[PDB]
Write a protein that binds this ligand. Structure first.
Ligand code: NAG
Ligand code: NAG
Ligand code: NAG
Ligand code: NAG
Ligand code: NA
Ligand code: NA
Lengths: 537, 537
């Protein structure tokens, strides 16, 4: 076989297809490569097995199945909500990898591996917003994405070997070995693999930097709006079992903590869709039913202890937060107030209501410590301020501050860190204006969506997209985002240093550099508030 | 008598003298006019009596005696410390008024009455820094100053009629009636009297706006770095008696609360200087041994209740604070650290030490509420930040915030208010650089000291002085500081409105207008911290 579009992997040979990128540039794609046996029947909830070797030529020409998950309807066929909806058929057999090489195909090049994230309950590598064609063609990089098991199918934990937990993470781990073993045949470098993700993507990518098993399976990491030290990232093993036994109860299975083997076997029987729909009990804002847990194999300790002791891969890190993280989550949660319409506001009374509902676990000697910190004292009753104040307290505690912590611990262990604050809101953003730049807005720009002519992105937005695609790309290459011009000295993007803590503002005409972001509020949630709760309890 | 320099007051006639202002302009002065009988012997601690009518022509040609007080030596003959030292002989007979008319002498003009302040323990109208010659000549206003009894001689309270308290305030009150009765003969208007002062000066001027007795004795008020709602402004009647009986003990007199008439009579005997030296017991920063008290005559309620109920003269108010209030007081107090030298700094440890010593009455669940508010979280251990952070917490609690409160209550009662933040540090400032603009720095500029050729003020500083002299002067005239150009619309200096809370920055090239100043920290000390101390106690 002299055919460039057929490739012989360890488990057999596959046939790809040449496709046009929206830009018009040509790339080679391999879509739906099985990296594991379908985790069905006795294999559900369990760690994945490598794929059974196949005979003949297999067609990897079309986008694979998305894993079984819930879909978002709460806004009907709104373009803003439907972009995160799975665009392929939902199946238990979802374990596949997608490889996209640029044309001409390089002999040995950089590898960028995208781990999607849906709060560990949803998502797929097949989303339109994650399109490898624009990124691979413009930056000349091998772009790879994977499907990992999600929700209770991926993250159910009972301590038993029939449900050991972290199945989704072991999925990713196995997919990383596939890359290590098979990427050079697509023209990549097994040692130059750079992992990058958003939400759980970042939380996943981070957990590979920590994990013993996936330690030497990649080179660098890019983390978007997520860290392993976030509140929603992990659950206690004691709770994870209760969440599992509650799911057993809710679905009509044996829920007794006495006999665990009864519970898992009954669960294996039930339909996958009824299983994922019964995960949602009483949960506050920004907390999810089934997520990573410290299993003993993938992780043998909590990420907090790993970070403290300094047990993580010595690597360059590119990480950052968006300006308005919370808004997205305060829309779905707390849906009464702050609905999907233009010009919404919040009265001082409604604000005071919200901080109780958004922080239900604090003693009230902490509530007004929050309200004093998160109110604008130049004009306290301002309806705009009180609304934006909700986004900040959610955004900072659940997202922004946790990113800062991980970035600092990496910086002070002598690693090069690059911190960003993404401030750009699209002109064509479908969501209301007040939302501003929400959680996951940068994705469209890192993947080169503005370079699509069929979409009406302004000419400046197309430049901006190419700019951050460059930053991202040559970081995966060189360990540094700075372009060759000004790479020699006084960078556009300074290093996030332990004491300096600098970040770059990613916006349309701003090259502004600050320190943080939001160091005061981070000091609030990390230092002041915890010791106050101690002193009042 | 057709002589312009002789004037016939109600109690007899006086003879003045023409003097050159440092600028070279000529003014007429009357210095050391007795407005009351000397409060000596049986009259000590008591309310003043009007002066006994005199026969013939009296010479009021030289600066009168300063009241008995302590002097500052702690810095030896330092020019910065010695400017507040009394420059006339110290006497118990100190009750006099000074009148300065410009030449040519107007038929009927505006009256600006200066009440000095030394924390109610010191000060005199005769200080070089308060010179009427420059102000009167340049702004064409009748400038008047008075001497009021100070320290325990002025503010001793025992509830007894032999020591009823507020003697210093009744001194001022009597001096205001003298002005009402006698100023038209000097070419002033009895109804256009505008009171203005600094430190206790402002606290005094404010207490005239409140008091029933001195209500109709003036028109407007200008208040510099002081309000009646400040912590050090008043003492409880229960404490004032104890402070008096402690002073009785310390001087070797009967200190028993049983027999009060014994105590006062023994006190009347003792030398005035030994009496003023034994006032200082255990007192924290920015608190003074003998100050105004609610006597029942001058004030029948606490200023807090007066402000709340809205019982104060409906008038225009011009008030403001300086950028670094605390520094001056943290130098004399807490003298170990933060000494008088260039380039002093504060370590993070020393900072944490200070907040305990500077706030000795807070439970420690409040101490770190302060440290979190008053630390710079971009670089927390910064030695410059930690030093400046001490000035702010002292400046805000003891001065700046209290000025804001009084200014707001006047604004929301429908009165016109003009708030300033004085940001200008002299080039020739004798104190160390880090001190910046300290408590009482604006005085030199409001009195026209830069217009003195024998002093090396820059040509811009001379313009600045004339500018704020103008603001001050035509406020006393018109009720508005704005010059005729731009007085018609969109003022240089906007009104401090109840909701807007605007202030003007008084500096060299800044016409900048903000809102506050320092609304966050004021909300801290006024709203947040008090309810936190409640929740933790
Ligand atoms: C994939 O192979 C099928 C036959 O199984 C063929 O019908 C189809 O055209 C192929 N599509 C590709 C490789 O583009
Ligand atoms: C940045 O801001 C605007 C962007 O529209 C523009 O004037 C120019 O590119 C820059 N200039 C500024 C802030 O003066
Ligand atoms: C004040 O009067 C005295 C006489 O008592 C006289 O010696 C002195 O020159 C006068 N000074 C004045 C008014 O300038
Ligand atoms: C105010 O600042 C300086 C004062 O020296 C001067 O450039 C000018 O008067 C003003 N201009 C600015 C801030 O650009
Ligand atoms: Na998420
Ligand atoms: Na004072």
């Amino acid at each position: 076989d002299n055919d460039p579009l057929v490739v012989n992997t360890d488990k057999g040979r596959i046939r790809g297809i040449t496709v046009d990128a929206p830009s018009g540039k040509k790339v080679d794609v391999w879509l739906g490569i099985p990296y594991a046996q379908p985790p069905v029947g006795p294999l559900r909830f369990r760690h994945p097995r490598p794929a059974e070797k196949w005979t003949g030529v297999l067609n990897t020409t079309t986008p694979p199945n998305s894993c079984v998950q819930i879909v978002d309807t709460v806004f009907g066929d709104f373009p803003g909500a439907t972009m995160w909806n799975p665009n392929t058929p939902l199946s238990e057999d979802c374990l596949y990898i997608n490889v996209v090489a640029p044309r001409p195909r390089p002999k040995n090049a950089a590898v960028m591996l995208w781990i999607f994230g849906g709060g560990f309950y949803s998502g797929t590598a097949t989303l339109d917003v994650y399109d490898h064609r624009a990124l691979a063609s413009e930056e000349n990089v091998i772009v790879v994405s994977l499907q990992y098991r999600v929700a209770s199918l991926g993250f159910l934990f009972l301590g038993t070997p029939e449900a050991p937990g972290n199945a989704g993470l072991f999925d990713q781990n196995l997919a990383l070995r596939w890359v290590r073993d098979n990427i050079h045949r697509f023209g990549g470098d097994p040692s130059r693999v750079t992992l990058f993700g958003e939400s759980a993507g970042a939380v996943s990518v981070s957990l590979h930097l920590l994990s013993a098993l996936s330690r030497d399976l990649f080179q660098r990491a890019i983390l978007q709006s997520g860290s392993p030290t976030a509140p929603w990232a992990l659950v206690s093993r004691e709770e994870a079992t209760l969440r599992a036994l509650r799911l057993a109860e809710a679905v009509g299975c044996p829920h007794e903590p006495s006999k665990l083997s009864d519970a898992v076997e009954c669960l294996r029987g039930k339909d996958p869709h009824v299983l994922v729909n019964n995960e949602w009990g009483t949960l506050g804002i920004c907390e999810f039913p089934f997520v990573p847990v410290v299993d003993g194999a993938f992780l043998d300790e909590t990420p907090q202890r790993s970070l403290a002791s300094g047990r993580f891969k010595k690597t360059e890190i590119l990480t950052g937060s968006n300006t308005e993280e919370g808004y997205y989550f305060i829309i779905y949660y707390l849906t009464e107030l702050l609905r999907k319409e233009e010009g919404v506001t919040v009265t001082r009374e409604e604000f005071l209501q919200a901080v109780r509902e958004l922080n239900p676990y604090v003693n009230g000697a902490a509530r007004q410590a929050i309200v004093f910190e998160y109110t604008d004292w130049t004009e306290p009753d301002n309806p705009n301020s009180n609304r934006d104040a909700l986004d900040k307290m959610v955004g900072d505690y659940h997202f922004t501050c946790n990113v800062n912590e991980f970035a600092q611990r990496y910086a002070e262990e002598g690693n090069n860190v690059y911190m960003y604050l993404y401030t750009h809101r699209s002109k064509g953003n479908p969501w209301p204006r007040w939302t501003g730049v929400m959680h996951g807005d940068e994705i469209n720009y890192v993947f080169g969506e503005p370079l699509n002519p069929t979409l009406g992105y302004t000419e400046d937005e197309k430049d901006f997209s190419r700019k951050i695609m460059r930053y991202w790309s040559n970081f995966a290459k060189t360990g540094n985002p700075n372009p060759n011009t000004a790479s020699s000295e006084f960078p556009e993007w300074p290093k996030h240093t332990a004491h300096g803590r600098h970040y770059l503002e990613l916006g349309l005409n701003t090259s502004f550099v600050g320190r943080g972001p939001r160091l005061r509020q981070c000091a609030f949630w990390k230092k002041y508030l915890p010791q106050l709760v101690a002193a009042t309890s």
